[PDB]
C-alpha cells in the first residue's frame, strides 16, 4: 500500500503564499469585518505607474501581490483591446465545448444584452434593464470596499482583486432622469459555480466619439458557500477555503496567460 | 466518468509562474548552455540589501523571484542561528520518523563528518574533502559559481538562493604544499524521492577574530541526470515531467523555510 509519488516529504497539501494572502484578504471582509452584500471579482487589465503613466514596472519574475501602500501610487485600467477580447472570447468558447464532453464538468453559458442607467442621489444608483423588453433586472448602489493588486510581468495582463458592496436599493422616482446611460454586452461562462464574464460596454459622450471598452472578470458564484468556508478558516480548518481560492485563482491565471 | 471537482475549467494541470521561471532557469543551464559538472542547490538564508546592509525589504506580500539586475546590488547569507538550525533539525527528525510509517515513502539518513582543505591555484581555491575518521580523500574539486536565482520571502524568516555551479574535479595538489584554509564540516543528510536535504555545521578559525561555527540548510537534486532528461523534454515541448520535479523541489523548500520557532 505504497504510492508512486508524494507531493512533498510530508505527504501533505502545501499552500503557496499567494493563496493564503488572498484567503486572509477575503476572510477579513467575509467574516471579520463582514460586507452584507459582498461582491468578489478579479478583473484583467493593466497596472499603471502614476509617475510614468505606463504599465507598472517591478524587478520581479512572477505574479506578485503588492502591498496596499502601493495602491496610492498606482492606477488600474480595467480596459482591454478588442483584439485581446476576441482572442479570449474564442478561447472560452472552445473551453466551453470541451467541457460538454463525457466525464467533464459542463460549462454554463448565458449571453445578456442590457442597459445601465445611473441616477443621482438625495455616488449613484445603477439600474439594469434588458435592451429588448426593458424589464428591470437589478437596482443597486455599488460601494468599493478594498482592492488587491497583482503585478504579472510574465503576462500581458495584470489583475485587480476587488471587494465591493452591491447595496440593493429601491427604484428611483418615475420622473427622475438618468445621469448616464451605457449599453452592456455580457457573455457569462459558469463553471463549478465560478463565473467568467466577458463584458463589452459602449460609452456615449456629448463631446467625444463613442468608445467601446472590453472587460473580463472572474467572480465567485456562491457567496453563501464561500462565506461558510471562510468561517471555518477563521475557526481553525482552512482547507476548503484554500481550495476554493486556489481554484478561483487558477482559472484567473489561465485567462491571463491567454494572449496572442 | 463524472467527477466531483476539477482542478480548473480546463481540467488541465496549471503551473504557477514561480515554477515556470525556475524551470526555465534550470533548463537554460542544463540544455541551452549546459554547465559542465553542474551542481543545483537551494540554500535557506537571508537576502541582504547592500544599501541598507540589512535584510532586503519589498512592498510585496508573497514569494518573489528577483530580476538579475538586483543580484549586483544585494548579497546572500546562508548562515542561520544555532537555535534555528536545531529547530529545523528536530523538525526533519520527526518527518524522518513519520516517513517510516506504513503507506509512506521512507526518508534516507546519512550523517557524514568531513574535513575541507583549501589550496591555491594560478583564480579560485581547490577543495579537498576527507573524512575525519579514516582521513581518506573523498573529493578534490574546483568549484565555480555560474548563476543565481534569489527568492525574497517576506512571510518567512528565511530567503532562498538557487545557485548553479561548475564543480570541476581536478588533480590532488602537490603533497608538499600546505592548505591555505582548513575547516571541519558536519553534515546530516536526508533523502526523500531523490531530493537531498542537507543540514550543515561548519566550524572554522581565524588568526585575529574569535569565530563561530556556521549553520546551513540546503536542498539538492539527487539524480542530476534525470533532471537533465526532464529538462530536455521540456525544451522539446513536453514540460510536464520537469514541472512536477521542480514543483516537488520548491514545495520541499517551502516547507523547511516556513519552519521557525
UniProtKB/Swiss-Prot annotation, chain A:
One Gene Ontology CC term in the entry: nucleus
Keywords from the UniProt entry: Hydrolase, mRNA capping, mRNA processing, Nucleus
UniProt cross-references to CDD domains, sorted A to Z: CYTH-like_mRNA_RTPase
InterPro entries: Cet1/Ctl1, CYTH-like_dom_sf, mRNA_triPase_Cet1, mRNA_triPase_Cet1_sf
UniProt KW Hydrolase keyword: yes
Compartments it resides in: Nucleus
Entry EC number(s): 3.6.1.74
Cofactor(s) the protein requires to work: Mg(2+)
Gene Ontology biological-process entries: 7-methylguanosine mRNA capping
Matching Pfam families: mRNA_triPase (PF02940)
Main location: nucleus
Family recorded in the similarity comment: Belongs to the fungal TPase family.
Reported function: First step of mRNA capping. Converts the 5'-triphosphate end of a nascent mRNA chain into a diphosphate end.
Assembly with partners or alone: Heterodimer. The mRNA-capping enzyme is composed of two separate chains alpha and beta, respectively a mRNA guanylyltransferase and an mRNA 5'-triphosphate monophosphatase.
Protein name: mRNA-capping enzyme subunit beta
Gene for this chain: pct1
Amino acid at each position: 500500500a505504497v504510492p508512486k509519488i508524494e507531493m512533498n516529504f510530508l505527504n501533505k497539501p502545501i499552500v503557496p503564499d499567494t493563496t493564503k494572502v488572498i484567503s486572509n484578504f477575503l476572510t477579513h471582509y467575509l467574516i471579520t469585518e463582514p460586507v452584507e452584500h459582498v461582491e468578489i471579482e478579479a478583473k484583467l487589465g493593466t497596472l499603471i505607474d502614476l509617475e510614468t503613466q505606463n504599465r507598472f514596472e517591478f524587478p520581479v519574475m512572477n505574479e506578485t501581490i503588492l502591498n496596499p501602500e502601493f495602491n496610492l501610487r498606482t492606477r488600474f485600467e480595467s480596459d482591454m483591446t478588442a483584439s485581446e477580447h476576441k482572442y479570449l472570447n474564442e478561447f472560452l468558447n472552445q473551453a466551453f465545448r470541451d467541457s460538454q464532453k463525457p466525464g467533464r464538468l459542463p460549462f454554463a453559458y448565458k449571453h445578456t444584452k442590457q442597459v445601465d442607467l445611473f441616477y443621482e442621489t438625495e455616488d449613484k444608483i445603477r439600474v439594469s434593464k434588458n435592451q429588448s423588453d426593458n424589464q428591470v433586472l437589478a437596482c443597486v448602489k455599488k460601494r468599493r470596499v478594498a482592492d488587491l493588486f497583482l503585478y504579472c510581468p510574465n503576462d500581458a495582463f495584470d489583475i485587480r482583486i476587488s471587494i465591493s458592496d452591491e447595496l440593493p436599493v429601491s427604484m428611483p422616482s418615475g420622473n427622475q432622469q438618468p445621469s448616464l446611460t451605457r449599453l452592456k454586452d455580457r457573455v457569462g461562462y459558469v463553471h463549478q459555480e465560478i463565473k467568467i464574464d466577458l463584458t463589452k460596454t459602449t460609452q456615449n459622450d456629448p463631446v467625444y466619439d463613442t468608445t467601446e471598452r472590453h472587460e473580463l472578470e472572474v467572480e465567485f458564484g456562491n457567496i453563501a458557500d464561500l462565506r461558510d468556508r471562510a468561517q471555518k478558516a477563521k475557526d481553525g480548518m482552512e482547507a476548503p477555503l484554500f481550495r476554493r481560492v486556489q481554484l478561483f485563482m487558477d482559472n484567473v491565471r489561465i485567462l491571463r496567460r491567454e494572449h496572442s
